[PDB]
Amino acid sequence: TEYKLVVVGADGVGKSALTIQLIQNHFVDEYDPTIEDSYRKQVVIDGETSLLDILDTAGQEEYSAMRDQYMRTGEGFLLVFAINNTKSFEDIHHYREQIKRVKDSEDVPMVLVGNKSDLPSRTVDTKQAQDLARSYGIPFIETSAKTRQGVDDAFYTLVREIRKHKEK
């Protein structure tokens, strides 16, 4: 099965670092902050061979019709913030609403991802993120793209959310 996964959130939260951890199994310090691109990873998840096509979003904020239609083809979304950046957490509502807007649905597979969990300079409490994810009805996964903590869990959980959505 193929899955179109989309990684969204504010600049600097670690979308590209998370993506490259999944694709290449290491931490890329410098990934061009402006570049939006996609990558495939083939993996077996709960016994099913899965082709994950991951869109790592970036670039200028714009809402062209092409862009709405492209985002609408995403099947599941990682809502990424960084635990050291409160503005990135406050921006999660916006990304969730843009997904709901283009998919014309209140029920889109999503996972809330609190990245940079290796850093000591926390300004977003785990409880804040758990409360937000509970209010959205979605899982919350703590990650570090630096150490790889939680990375497979975030992507595989999103795949499991898509499978559950298909059966509703």
Ligand X SMILES: Nc1nc2c(ncn2[C@@H]2O[C@H](COP(=O)(O)OP(=O)(O)O)[C@@H](O)[C@H]2O)c(=O)[nH]1
Residues that bind ligand 6IC (CB under 6 A): 8, 10-11, 57-59, 61, 63, 67-68, 71, 91, 94-95, 98-99, 102
What x-and-dash track marks residues 44-83 binding Mg ion by CB under 5 A? Answer: --------------x-------------------------
User: Residue 111 contacts by C-beta under 8 Å, 6 or more apart in sequence?
Assistant: 76, 77, 78, 79, 138, 139, 140, 141, 154, 157, 158, 161
- Cα 55–chain centre separation: 9
Indicate the residue among 62 and 167 with the shorter CB distance to ligand X: 62
Query: Quick count: other Cβ atoms within 10 Å of Cβ 28?
Result: 13
Among 8, 14, 16, 158, binds Mg ion (CB under 5 A): 16
- Please report, as ranges, the residues that interact with ligand X according to CB under 6 A: 11-17, 29, 31, 33, 115-116, 118-119, 144-146
Q: How far is CA 92 from CA 10, 13, 80, in A?
A: 8, 11, 8
| 28 versus 63: smaller Cβ distance to ligand 6IC | 63
What does the block give as tokens for 19?
């993506």
Q: Which residues bind Mg ion (CB under 5 A)?
A: 15-16, 58
